């Protein structure tokens, strides 16, 4: 359905730059897998 | 948004002596579009920055990254062993695998359950889990699709393994 380039081209789309919801972020931070200074 | 063929779930295993191997695994989130995948990937540490003894896993269809799971029990995995590969090469290889999965590049995409990456001392592994081990047609099509797609070096080895303990 999607090639490598297709998927990559959408990486920096405005929607793709959307942050995670605050619950998910809270989880991501708690696991300490949240990207630093993101 | 661009819908994916399948829903996927990201897991993160953290090594904790006090917790059983199954309990070490944590369910992070699920997504079903390309934009929601990137939103997640762009805000999580790459495998290069997670602790030793920890794993990332991406599985579809609410399949747990465990042998006990129905979809995995009769299956196997393509294992790639990486020795002292650059951290940027490791991250780029992990992502390349993720894009093969959600992109459903494999002709036998239905047979694939998910992918796993293990960050360990002296060696890091990336594995792609399959549903049925007896199916050589699926296992090989996926296997061949990898070395070409991953552009694997000659040094790095790609070998298939059954989950179940039998020869």
From Swiss-Prot, chain B:
Protein name according to UniProt: Eukaryotic translation initiation factor 4E1
Q: Give any Gene Ontology cellular component.
A: neuronal ribonucleoprotein granule
Tissues expressing this chain: Expressed at the posterior end of developing oocytes (at protein level). Preferential expression in the pole cells, at different developmental stages.
Where mainly located? cytoplasm
GO biological process terms, alphabetically, are: regulation of translation; RNA metabolic process; translation; translational initiation
Coiled-coil annotation reads: none
Q: How does it assemble?
A: eIF4F is a multi-subunit complex, the composition of which varies with external and internal environmental conditions. It is composed of at least eIF4A, eIF4E1 and eIF4G1. Recruited by cup in oocytes and in early embryos, preventing the interaction with eIF4G. The interaction with cup therefore prevents the translation of key transcripts such as oskar (osk) and nanos (nos) in some regions in the early embryo. Interacts with mxt. Interacts with 4E-T and Thor.
Compartment(s): Cytoplasm, Cytoplasmic ribonucleoprotein granule; Cytoplasm; Nucleus, Nuclear body
* Organism per entry: Drosophila melanogaster
């Amino acid at each position: 359905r999607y090639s490598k380039v297709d998927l990559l081209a959408l990486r920096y789309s405005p929607l793709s730059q959307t942050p995670p919801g605050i619950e998910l972020e809270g989880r991501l931070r708690r696991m300490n897998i949240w990207r630093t200074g993101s | 948004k661009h819908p994916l063929m399948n829903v996927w779930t990201l897991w993160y295993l953290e090594n904790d002596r006090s917790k059983s191997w199954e309990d070490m695994q944590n369910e992070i989130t699920s997504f079903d579009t390309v934009e929601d995948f990137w939103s997640l990937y762009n805000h999580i540490k790459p495998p290069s920055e997670i602790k030793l003894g920890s794993d990332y896993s991406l599985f579809k269809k609410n399949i747990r990254p465990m042998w006990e799971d129905a979809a995995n029990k009769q299956g196997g995995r393509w294992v790639i062993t990486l020795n002292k590969s650059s951290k940027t090469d490791l991250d780029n290889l992990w992502l390349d695998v993720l894009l093969c999965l959600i992109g459903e590049a494999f002709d036998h995409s239905d047979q694939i359950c998910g992918a796993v990456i293990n960050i360990r001392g002296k060696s890091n592994k990336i594995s792609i889990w399959t549903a049925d081990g007896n199916n050589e047609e699926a296992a090989l099509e996926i296997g061949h699709k990898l070395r070409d797609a991953l552009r694997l070096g000659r040094n790095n080895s790609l070998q298939y393994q059954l989950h179940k303990d039998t020869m």
